[PDB]
């Protein structure tokens, strides 16, 4: 409602680096809200694209941004009789960043990994990794939960059970309020998906620079289901956390499997033990129900109402039998005796191939009226196809039917504006949360300050 776009602030990264692919705020020790922006294609030290993370300080003028000095160099270690080998090449270090208020958990899902024992190897694959970094103390810490070392001759002899080599862990990462780190590995157990929950304080404590294979010993991965619905589910493709089971100590994950049950897609809710609480099947196939999950109380009832993006949902019209516009669901968590799972609201896009719903951002109380207000984005919506960000306030029974205000992209066509948003973080202390939109196609990030 109040995200006046006349005077933005544009943060720009190296040209050709997708600067803005994934972003999140980071409150420093002084309360100086600095923007973390992930650029999965920034050139490294070998003239190769190996990601990079740009901790943007909040400047009312935007511009360039100093990067976070991370490890972009391939590391090899002859531990035991195995050639432990990491290939930090095309790893996309920044494909999904997140900050636990002093730690920048910037992940690299496509970071390969290979171990050799004199004839054979683990079939080098993107096990992914998540480089952690405190901007104040500057102590790096890696965390790759899926760096196995079982030879490929054993996986083929176990019907690929516990085949967490393809994890791409850090594909979608969220850090709980208590301090855990919840990676989304939508390749774990052979593209069936998993999660890794290792507390942040227990990653710094148990990280020795130099050894590649190590188990945190406090982590907890998901389980390899054998239900043919789960196969090729890309489970954990986009995860979020909330409170869906009463115990305020534990937290509940909102894992979204977009290709679930033969492309139908379902967003599962599950407690800290990965035991399924809820499961929200999608309407129609090939719509990525669950490509982008979000969780916020959109009706001020104390319940964590989740939202599920369906970027490729094909609505029904009178001209096109099914014209692909996208759809954002709203599963209000019932405060009564019934259960979550009935879609309370169905927000649908307007522009064909706009992928309306590929990135939802719980801005929180944007206009200070009690109820939180998400902001959906269509990376190719609008009347021209340069992107669009729509702000849906939530009145009392869920969200508003019509978007309060749209944010037409100020970047040229192809910028994919809206591919990554973040909200509910006041970046200059107007008292109001300020939405920042990641236009990775134009290698920039736009900051929309919410003037009251």
């Amino acid at each position: 409602l109040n995200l006046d776009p006349v005077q933005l602030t544009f943060y720009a990264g190296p040209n050709g680096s997708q600067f803005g692919f994934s972003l999140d705020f980071h409150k420093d020790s002084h309360g100086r809200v600095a923007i973390v922006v992930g650029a999965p294609r920034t050139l490294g030290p070998s003239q190769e694209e190996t990601g990079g993370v740009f901790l943007c300080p909040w400047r009312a003028e935007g511009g360039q941004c100093p990067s976070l000095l991370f490890d972009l160099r391939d590391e090899t270690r002859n531990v035991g009789s195995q050639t432990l080998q990491t290939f930090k090449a095309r790893q996309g270090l920044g494909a999904s960043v997140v900050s636990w208020s002093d730690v920048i958990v910037a992940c690299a899902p496509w970071q390969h990994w290979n171990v050799l024992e004199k004839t054979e190897e683990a079939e080098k694959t993107p096990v992914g990794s998540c480089f952690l970094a405190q901007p104040e103390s500057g102590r790096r810490a890696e965390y790759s939960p899926c760096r196995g070392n079982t030879l490929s001759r054993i996986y083929v002899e176990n019907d690929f059970s516990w085949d967490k080599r393809y994890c791409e862990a850090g594909f979608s990462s969220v850090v709980t309020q208590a301090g855990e780190l919840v990676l989304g590995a939508p390749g774990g157990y052979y593209f069936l998906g998993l999660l890794a929950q290792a507390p942040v304080a227990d990653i710094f404590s148990s990280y020795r620079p130099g050894i590649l294979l190590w188990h945190v010993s406090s982590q907890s991965l998901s389980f390899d289901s054998s239900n043919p619905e789960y196969f090729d589910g890309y489970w954990g493709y986009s995860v979020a956390v909330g409170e869906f089971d009463g115990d305020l100590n534990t937290t509940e994950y909102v894992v979204g499997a977009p290709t679930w049950s033969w492309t139908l897609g379902a967003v599962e809710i599950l407690d800290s033990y990965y035991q399924r609480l809820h499961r929200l099947r999608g309407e129609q196939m090939a719509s990525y129900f669950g490509h982008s999950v979000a969780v916020t109380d959109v009706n001020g009832d104390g319940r964590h109402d989740l939202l599920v993006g369906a970027p490729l949902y094909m609505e029904s019209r009178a001209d096109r039998k099914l014209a692909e516009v996208g759809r954002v669901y709203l599963f209000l968590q019932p405060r009564g005796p019934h259960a979550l799972g009935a879609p309370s609201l169905l927000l649908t896009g307007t522009q064909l191939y706009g992928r309306f719903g590929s990135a939802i951002a719980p801005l929180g109380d944007l206009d200070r009226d009690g109820y939180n207000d998400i902001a959906v984005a269509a990376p190719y919506g609008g009347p021209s196809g340069r992107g669009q960000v729509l702000v849906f306030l939530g009145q009392s029974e869920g969200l508003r039917s019509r978007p309060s205000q749209v944010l037409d992209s100020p970047f040229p066509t192809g910028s994919a504006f809206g591919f990554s948003l973040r909200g509910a973080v006041d970046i200059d202390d107007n008292g109001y949360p300020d939405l920042i939109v990641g236009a990775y196609g134009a290698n920039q990030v736009a900051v929309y300050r919410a003037q009251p």
Epitope: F244, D245, G246, R276, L277, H278, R279, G300, D301, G302, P334, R335, G336, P337, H338, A339, G341
Partner: antibody, heavy 116, light 107 residues
Framework: EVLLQQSGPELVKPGASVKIPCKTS????????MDWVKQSHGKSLEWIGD????????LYNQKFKDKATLTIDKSSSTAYMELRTLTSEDTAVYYC??????????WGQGTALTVS | DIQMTQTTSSLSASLGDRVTISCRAS??????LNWYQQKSDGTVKLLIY???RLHSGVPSRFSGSGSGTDYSLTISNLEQEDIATYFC?????????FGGGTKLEIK
Amino acid sequence: EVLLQQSGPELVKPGASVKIPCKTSGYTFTDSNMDWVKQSHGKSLEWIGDINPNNGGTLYNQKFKDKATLTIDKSSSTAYMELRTLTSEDTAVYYCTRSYYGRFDYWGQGTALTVS
Amino acid sequence: DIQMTQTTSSLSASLGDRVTISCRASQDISNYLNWYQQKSDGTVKLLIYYTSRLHSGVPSRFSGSGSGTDYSLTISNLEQEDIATYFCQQGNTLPPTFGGGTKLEIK
């Protein structure tokens, strides 16, 4: 420790209403709803109506929807169900349960009702 | 609505033993199914919820192994304090309908 300590046994002439108060202690009141369940003589219990402490929600069973005017006292952490037009067939025990994430955790006592 | 049925309305076995309270759902629900222990003279409390989640103030003997429509409560080491009427509640779709109630008897 939260106890939903309810009222005592009542007796009502037929055709006259009756009020069943359910006090809540501990447990800041507006965290969860305050449902209601009627247990008949055959010890088969079916629930009556929901109500939302923040704002009167009054979600009913569509079988008791008429004669279960559910009320609430947010300030005094109390909850009512004000049964109306009572008949001889609706003499039962009326629990004052609490919903909390779609369960009925905590019920408390149970108000014996009698119609003569 | 959804009609919940407990076939055996009166189950019986010796103390210190395991018994399984059955419960069926007319319409296929998910894994939403609570369990309530009601002993003599009221004082009904909540057992395992969501078909297996022990409540805060309940022993660790109770456990449920239901999925789909066929739900159960397999109580282990039946003590003297576990004789009660056990009601299964569906809590998926309004209105949540309880079960028929299984009377327990120590033998």
